[PDB]
Structures are given as C-alpha cells and as structure tokens.
C-alpha cells in the first residue's frame, strides 16, 4: 500500500496515452463466419507434418487478409499532422504492419511493445510467414534493434487469445487505424448444447473484428467497406487457392456453401458413390511425379469426380 | 422552451463529467452462460421462504463474484495521480465497492449518486449481503452521511435492469475501473420461438459484462484475465459450495455440464430409477438433527445415489 513514482518503460507508456487524448476516434464492429478457416488450416498443417515443417496460426491468416484489404482501400493507411501550423494528410510509401509482442522484463512485470513487419505490400503468403516468424524469434532471444520499433503505419491486436468477445482499443499518434481480433468460440447461448444437436442444425463458430480510426482523415463509409472486404476474402475461392499454391498443398481447398437437405438421393448413397470414385479414378491426382511438371502438349483428363 | 442555468446536484454532475475528459480509457466486452445462476438462486430463495428470510438478487451474486475477482487480480484496484508534479501509482488498503443508487429529489427530478460498501475483502457472502442491504435501507429513509460517499476504489452499474444489452460508460477521477452488467434475456433471434423447440435444442440465457479502465495504470491483458476469472467463478463448484454453506441450504448445488443425447438407456428409465432412490435412501439426507452435529468417530454412508 501507498504511493510510488512511475519509472522506466511504464513512464513512457503513461506519457503516450496522455498524448492519445488529442485524436478524435470512432469504431466499427462486424461478425464473420469462421468454419472454412478451421477446415482449410487443418489441410495446410497436415501437409507441413509430412515435410517436417511447423504449424500456421489463425493470426497468420487474418494478418495476411488485412494486408490485402489495405491494398484494396488505401485511405486506411493515411494519418494526420500539423506541419508549419497547417493541417496535413500524410500518405506513406509502404504498408508496415505492427504486431503486439508481450516481453517480460528482468524484474518480472509484463510490458507490451509494438514491432513492425516492413514492406508488406511486396510479399506473397510464404514471404509474409517468414517475415512474421523472424520478429517473434528475435524477440524471444532479445535481438531486436531501434529500427524494428520505428515506422509503423497500421497495427493488429488479439484480445481473443484470453477469450474476450470484442474490445474498443486506443489509437497511438502517427497512425490512422488499429484492427482487433476477438474470440473464435460458439456464442454463450450454445455453450451447454450437445455436439449432436449443433451438428444437426448447422451452427458454426464466428470471429468478431473491430476497426478504430482517426475521423479527421478516414470517414465511416471507408471503414465499413474495409471490414466487408476482409469478410469476403476469408470465404473466397481465389484467396485460398493463392495460400495453398505457396505452401505446396496438392489437394483442392474446401469451398463455402449452404447446408443442403437430405431429400431425393439419400446422403448415405452419396458417400458410397464417393468411395467408388476414389477406388476407380483416384490415381489421376496422386503424388507420382518427382518434378512439378505437366507436359503442355498433352490433354488434361477431367477429375471433378 | 429556452435557456435555463444548471443549479444544485445537476451542476456538480456536469463539472465531474468535464474533469473525466483527462482520463484515457479502453473497454473489454465478454458474454457468459447464465443457466446455473437461475437454478442455484431458486434453491437459496426456497430455503429462505421456509425460515421467513428475504430474497437474494442477481446483483448480489455478481457483486460478490466481482470482489473475489479483484482479490485474484489486484492491479484492477489501482489509480493514477500527479503529486508534487510527478506521475504516481496509488495502491489502496481496502476494496470499497460503489453501488449506483438512484434517489428522487424534493422537486421530482431523478439524480444518481454512488454509495460505498467498505472493507469488502474481509467478508463472506452472509456478511456481504447484510452490508449491501444496510446501504439500500438507509438510502430509502434518508439516513446516509458524508462518510458513506467517500473512498470508493471500484464501481458496479446495471443497465440490464431496463433491458439494455451492453453499454460503454464513463470513468470518474479517483478510480481505475468500472464494471457494467447487461440484460439476462435470450438473444433477439430467439424471442419468437416456442418453449418446446428451445428446450429440445438446449439454448440457455446469457449475461454480457464490460470493463472500462484507465490505460495509464491497467493494461489490456489484465482486464481480459479479470473477465475470464468472473466467467469461471459463476460456473465453479467451490464458489456455489461457499454460498450454500453461508445461507444454510441442506442440498448439494446443481453442477455445470453439457446436455447428453437420449441414447442407450432411455431418459424415462433414468427418471424412474431416481424415484426409487429417494423412496429407499432419501432418509440419509433428511433434516432430522436439531443440532448441526456429525459424530467424528462413526463412518459416513455413501449418498451419491
């Protein structure tokens, strides 16, 4: 008990939160289906354990989707400053994405600091995954420099780790938006139901994503369009084709569709026809060629079956 | 119509909301299952109508859970001040919990003021319930003093009374967090469904809880951990054992579990086996001893049946 002066990294955090009071902010909230993420992530991690690679996370996939969305809506990367006493709009050269990395101090007290993945608008998924894991690696063995903490344009936070549903976070001076990712659980009204009953109805898991922006330079219509593009990408055929291509997954990705009723030809008959198809025609998609080669002259057989 | 100067208690409220602009705040939101509260509250109120006691409310139970959570995460009870021109962290001696009590004035206009339950970290549930009902009693007959309104460390508000789903409230100078409790209804997408269909699926009621905190002294990870502990407590065996012990309820509390499917031995057979168990072995848990005495030498029979 009593009074103690604030010192060190904790004094720096306190001063920056006082400066943040001079930014007028507004937030947008949107909830998105998550089923196709769960399925297609399992297919990539199955391929990597064959080749003694690692895992990919949900933060990797949502992070990459965020970069694609900022390229589609570039107003989200702008900021405000007063230069020679006049109001000014600042348009950067690169998209530099800040991650919220929590590193414990020598004393024991936790202190969050934001490190940057730089020049993200020139990367494919493989390049992006490498750059990400570099920052996380060096942080765990204390080898980040002064340049790693400078030049952030847009930021990403993950309250969903602990299990928070959504947050309204603060925006630090220099940037235009901060994006937050909430929990990927069932809603609380379904948390005591049977797996059988949920499977019958067709109830999926959801993720809630937030956008907190500076209203002097970004308008509300732009922030809404940004969240709509992120929703579309996480259910889109072309998006999941690009990721599978980069990680060398031989199968076609699972596609987004509505549940169909068990009418006409019974679903058991349909599962028996799938077993016959693989026993007859499955050799047409098998890992038999040691080169990644298709002879351009020859015609490709149909394997939609 | 026209312009009228603000006077009295309404002028004091206006001045405090102007001072609140110098606190940088952030909010976290979490939704929690509520079924086990509804069931176990009914068992306590059944015992009290036998002994011509009163009722307990949902605000009593959530209030007590809040005190247990602040003891598990003591950073949530700290505040900020500038003392001799230096930044300072203030760690109090006690947890003093402020209730939002609305008392009408002589004119007729409603005016909310916050009264404090003091030294809450030294109380069991019985002691807590007494202290709470003291403040509410004295407020209704105009016998609160100046000392009742001074020294609040943390606060609780209930927008859910009217039926609001959640709020983003303001934080008054002197404190570090304010907790808000929303509505305990079904979601709006289920408000026109049959009781039969909802019972079949296994759909429960939920409560949404918010945390609004000063970012100069409390970080987001701490606020999320605080809401996770409150969620766990309201479904925990040990928590409900402690409340039942204090209020002298002779039965075991209802426990948290997932709905099981009607397979193998039919559920009707299981209900008939429960009727036989009580008719045979129910005397082993009956209110037959006028003392609260168990002979330590003798062995206790099994009554899990």
Swiss-Prot record, chains A, B:
Annotated protein name in UniProt: 2-oxoglutarate dehydrogenase E1/E2 component
Similarity field: In the N-terminal section; belongs to the alpha-ketoglutarate dehydrogenase family.
Domain note: OdhA is a fusion protein with two major domains exhibiting structural features of an E1 and E2 protein, and a short sequence stretch of E1 localized at the N-terminus, which is connected by a linker region to the rest of the protein. Deletion of individual parts of odhA show that all parts of odhA are required for a functional tricarboxylic acid cycle in C.glutamicum; the ODH activity is in fact completely abolished in each of these mutants, and the PDH activity is significantly reduced, which could indicate that the overall structure of the supercomplex is disturbed.
Active site per UniProt: 215 (proton acceptor)
Comment field (misc): Is non-lipoylated. In contrast, the E2 component AceF is the prominent lipoylated protein in C.glutamicum.
Effect caused by changing residue 215 to C: Loss of E2 succinyltransferase activity, and 2-fold reduction in E1 dehydrogenase activity
Subunit structure, as described in the record: Homodimer. Part of an unusual ODH/PDH supercomplex, consisting of AceE (E1), AceF (E2), and Lpd (E3) together with OdhA (E1+E2). Interacts with the FHA domain of unphosphorylated OdhI via its C-terminal dehydrogenase domain.
Signal peptide: none
Effect of residue 219 to D: Slight reduction in E2 succinyltransferase activity and in E1 dehydrogenase activity
Mutant phenotype after disruption: Strains lacking this gene completely lack 2-oxoglutarate dehydrogenase activity. Deletion of odhA also causes L-glutamate overproduction and accumulation during growth.
Region (Succinyltransferase E2): 1-236
Function: Catalyzes the E1 and E2 reactions as part of 2-oxoglutarate dehydrogenase (ODH) activity, to convert 2-oxoglutarate to succinyl-CoA and CO(2). OdhA has reductase activity with 2-oxoglutarate but does not react with pyruvate, and also displays transsuccinylase but no transacetylase activity. Since OdhA is not lipoylated, the succinyltransferase activity of its E2 domain is dependent on lipoyl residues of the acetyltransferase AceF.
